């Protein structure tokens, strides 16, 4: 079974089983087109494929661009096959992905990095078109080669940026994997410390903060507590402004909102 995948110039170890056809899933290695995400049995097949394949980026629309860094919005109804391949690809690095086959109700936000051969996949997140639970991310992943460089954070940030622009608040779909939780804590703490740094008033509601960041109140409260910034007193709750933490908090690993060009689908 699948231990490795060739992806562009990288050779990547898989963490988890993913349900590819047993035709493919009985091999040890799997050869992927880095641009259209077709999976193949051998180098020599991949090689002929790259000679035929016209794609140099993901389908859909490019809704963020800042130099070499893009995000594309791909509709799972319009690009059913690309989105499926991407879900299969992701299950190799997620313990549990809820859905693979049915990508129609999803939009896929594919972040890339451009070099002279094309726009290379850094990572993605999926979004329900219409979430009863107001989840603004279903699944998020940064590819192994790109992990721990700040990209996942840009992705998360970009999810809440779409939320601001839609005038919604959002949260990631429960349950969070452990790397997901570590990543969302770091993001949320940062959003909170940033907010308080710029805020000058003597009081705020959790709701105001939620309305401004598009972060969910329970996620805010939850982070305040992780930060031991929620205190109790008289018979009311106070927010403790930890300056040690704010100044702790002070490589182009940011999403710049003036580089978004988007209408909600």
């Amino acid at each position: 079974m699948i231990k490795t995948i060739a992806f562009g110039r990288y050779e990547l170890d898989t963490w988890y089983h993913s349900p590819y056809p047993e035709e493919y899933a009985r091999l040890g290695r799997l050869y992927m087109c880095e641009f259209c995400l077709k999976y193949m049995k051998s180098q020599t097949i991949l090689r002929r494929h790259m000679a035929k394949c016209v794609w140099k980026h993901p389908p859909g629309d490019e809704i963020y661009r800042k130099g070499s860094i893009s995000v594309f919005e791909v509709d799972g109804k319009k690009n059913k096959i690309y989105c499926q391949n991407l879900c299969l690809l992701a299950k190799l690095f997620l313990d549990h992905k809820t859905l693979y086959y049915d990508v129609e109700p999803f939009l896929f936000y594919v972040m890339t990095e451009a070099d002279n051969t094309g726009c290379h996949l850094i990572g993605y997140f999926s979004k329900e078109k219409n979430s009863f639970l107001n989840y603004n991310v279903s699944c998020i992943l940064t590819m192994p080669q790109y992990m721990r460089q700040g990209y996942g954070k840009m992705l998360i940030d970009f999810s809440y940026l779409l939320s601001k622009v839609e005038e919604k608040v959002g949260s990631p779909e429960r349950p969070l994997s452990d790397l997901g939780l570590i990543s969302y804590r770091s993001y949320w703490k940062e959003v909170l410390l940033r907010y308080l740094h710029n805020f000058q008033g003597k009081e705020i509601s959790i709701k105001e903060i939620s309305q401004e960041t598009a972060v969910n109140p329970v996620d805010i409260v939850s982070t305040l507590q992780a930060l031991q910034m929620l205190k109790y007193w008289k018979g009311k709750h106070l927010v403790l402004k930890r300056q040690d933490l704010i100044d702790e908090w002070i490589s182009n690993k940011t999403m710049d909102p003036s580089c978004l060009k988007w209408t909600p689908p």
Partner: peptide, 24 residues
């Protein structure tokens, strides 16, 4: 409203009430 624990105590907090931002 939302529930959690602080300094060994159960607490419950509003998300609409203004909370005193405080220092020491």
């Amino acid at each position: 409203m939302v529930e959690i624990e602080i300094e060994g105590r159960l607490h419950r907090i509003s998300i609409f009430d203004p909370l005193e931002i405080i220092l020491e």
